[PDB]
Amino acid sequence: DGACPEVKPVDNFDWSQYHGKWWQVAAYPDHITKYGKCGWAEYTPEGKSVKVSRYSVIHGKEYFSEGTAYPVGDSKIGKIYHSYTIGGVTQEGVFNVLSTDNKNYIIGYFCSYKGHMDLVWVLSRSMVLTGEAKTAVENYLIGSPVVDSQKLVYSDFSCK
Ligand SMILES: C[C@]12CC[C@H](O)C[C@H]1CC[C@@H]1[C@@H]2CC[C@]2(C)[C@@H](C3=CC(=O)OC3)CC[C@]12O
């Protein structure tokens, strides 16, 4: 209930950090049921874009999807376009980067608007957030105006 909040994406975004495998270590349950559990993605830079190949388990079945990602505007601001193709259907959109250390983690956020639905997912280079990345992610959630830490579900890559 309400319109989507004034999200202020980052102003320090480094695109060169996205290559190799990133694990989805946490998200909102609406995100896990719609885009899958056990989620990981391999990014492959292709000029200005990054091509995405992602694995997840959606309604008990395994899928690969594919996508392309591009920056919108000044790449430093953390507004990201992304296409998403799975089972012969393509979707596209823009999301915003809430927080990142330009090394280990990225928190992404999307909202669609008399009500609003919000989707939050957390990617990391490691299968578990430890140490540096964890303390960063927690201090962010404490001060955050739009993310409900209580609502984040953490992945257990223990999946089939
Ligand atoms: C921006 C986006 C556009 C397509 C649909 O409108 C859903 C939104 C919110 C979710 C968002 C897609 C665009 C694709 C995504 C980044 C995709 C992911 C790739 C990844 O590494 O983590 C998630 C799953 C779904 C996704 O998280």
Describe this structure in words.
The chain is built from 2 helices and 9 strands. The chain has helices at about 30-35, 130-145, and strands at about 20-25, 35-45, 50-60, 60-70, 80-85, 90-100, 105-110, 115-125, 155. The termini are far apart. The longest helix is centred in the C-terminal third of the chain and has 13 residues, at about 130-145. It is mostly beta strands and about 160 residues long. The protein has one domain: Lipocalin. The chain has an 8-stranded antiparallel beta barrel. Digitoxigenin binds near residues 52 and 93.
The share of residues in helices is: 10-25%
Largest sheet: 8 strands, antiparallel, barrel
Structural class: mainly beta
In the CATH hierarchy, what is the architecture at level 2?
Beta Barrel
Q: Specify the number of helices.
A: 2
And the CATH topology? Answer: Lipocalin
Oligomer: monomer
Radius of gyration: 15 Å
**Widest sheet: strand ordering:** 1-2-3-4-5-6-7-8
Number of strands: 9
The number of domains is 1
The CATH superfamily title = Calycin beta-barrel core domain
Gap between N and C termini: 37 Å
CATH C-level label: Mainly Beta
- Shape, please? globular
Tell me the β content. Answer: over 45%
What is bound: which ligands? digitoxigenin
Protein name: Bilin-binding protein
GO molecular function, one term: pigment binding
Function: This protein binds the blue pigments bilins.
Subcellular location: Secreted
